[PDB]
């Protein structure tokens, strides 16, 4: 029995060019140029999920830090208060009431100042 | 309501003729006539015929009146290609691609 290629080879090229929509020029038109481009975007995904994680942390720290310096002290200390003060809030919520509820954060500088020494 | 004419298998290269069709898109019917009547390009002729055969189809088949017409849209699709060998130096040969067009014109009544 002979089994000609038929539907199969095209169907699989279809499945790709679907994913490749939005790509510039031939990266969305040719299969062979889409699949390359997709590979790349594939690893870029992965590795950026990770990177995204530290980059929101990164942001938060700046904002916490920026809030702190309005109350004289920096961030590098502001932590050490909080840490030996037994508080356990994370940076996201820290940078939250930082922006949103300044009176609570400003309260949090107190426990910190009182503690660190 | 819109009228439509299409001339197919016109033995002239779409690139060249499209240049013309672009000059009259959206223009009034009377506008276009003069623009074609005095365009220094071979295309115009062909474009004109369709444009005139378009107008006729308007009044004689689609009920609409002559003095309201305009190029609602017009385009040039390409068609088959007469392929012909041109002999080159050192006995190599080429292929001359003699293209062809499918000109269309869509005429429309200016409402009001």
């Amino acid at each position: 029995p002979r089994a000609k290629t038929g539907v199969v080879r095209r169907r699989k090229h279809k499945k790709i060019l679907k994913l490749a929509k939005g790509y510039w020029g031939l990266r969305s038109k040719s299969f062979r140029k889409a699949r390359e481009t997709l590979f790349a975007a594939g690893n870029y995904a992965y590795a950026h999920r990770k990177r995204r994680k530290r980059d929101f942390r990164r942001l938060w720290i700046v904002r916490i830090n920026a809030a702190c310096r309005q109350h004289g002290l920096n961030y590098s200390t502001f932590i050490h208060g909080l840490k030996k003060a037994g508080i356990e809030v994370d940076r996201k919520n820290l940078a939250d009431l930082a922006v949103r509820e300044p009176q609570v954060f400003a309260e949090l500088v107190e426990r910190a100042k009182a503690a660190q020494g | 309501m819109e009228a439509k004419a299409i001339a197919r298998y016109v033995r002239i290269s779409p690139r060249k003729v499209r240049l013309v069709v672009d000059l009259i898109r959206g223009k009034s019917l009377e506008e276009a006539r003069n623009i074609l009547r005095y365009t220094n390009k071979r295309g115009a002729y062909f474009v004109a015929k369709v444009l005139e055969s378009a107008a006729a189809n308007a009044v004689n088949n689609h009920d609409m009146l002559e003095d309201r017409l305009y190029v609602k849209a017009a385009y040039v699709d390409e068609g088959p290609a007469l392929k012909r060998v041109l002999p080159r130096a050192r006995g190599r040969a080429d292929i001359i691609k003699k293209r062809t067009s499918h000109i269309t014109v869509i005429l429309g009544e200016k409402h009001g």
Partner: protein
């Protein structure tokens, strides 16, 4: 839950003075004031820093033998295109540039940095046309 993103700002204007301040160590704070990393909601991808006005930029001071041992360079494009410019050569000629230029080198390069540099206004002497905006005597 998602991180707060600021809506549109009403950027604070700032006057800052420059007699006696060290060239560099002043600039670095302009730069952070420029970026707006001093503000509690600072966002990396937006103009939302501060407007900065500088008076007495002539009066800027620098240690060492910098005052004429430092040389700024500029590349004209041609063969022999490198021009070399001493420090005060620059000063008493275009005092403005000296602090001006030490800051651009502290702002991120590309579209946003270029925009942020734009908000910095630098002047020799004690004068500035911006009574309009009523700039604040920021006193770092």
């Amino acid at each position: 839950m998602k991180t707060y993103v600021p809506k549109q700002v009403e950027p604070r204007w700032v006057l800052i003075d420059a007699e006696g301040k060290t060239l560099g160590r002043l600039a670095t704070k302009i730069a952070t004031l420029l970026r707006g990393k001093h503000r509690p909601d600072w966002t990396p991808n937006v103009a939302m820093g501060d407007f900065v006005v500088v008076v007495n930029a002539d009066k800027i001071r620098v240690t060492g033998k910098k005052l004429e041992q430092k040389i700024y360079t500029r590349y004209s494009g041609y063969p022999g295109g490198l021009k070399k410019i001493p420090l005060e050569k620059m000063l008493a000629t275009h005092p403005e540039r000296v602090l001006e230029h030490a800051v651009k080198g502290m702002l991120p390069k590309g579209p946003l940095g270029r925009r942020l540099f734009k908000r910095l206004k630098v002047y020799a002497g004690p004068d500035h046309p911006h009574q309009a905006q009523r700039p604040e005597k920021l006193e770092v």
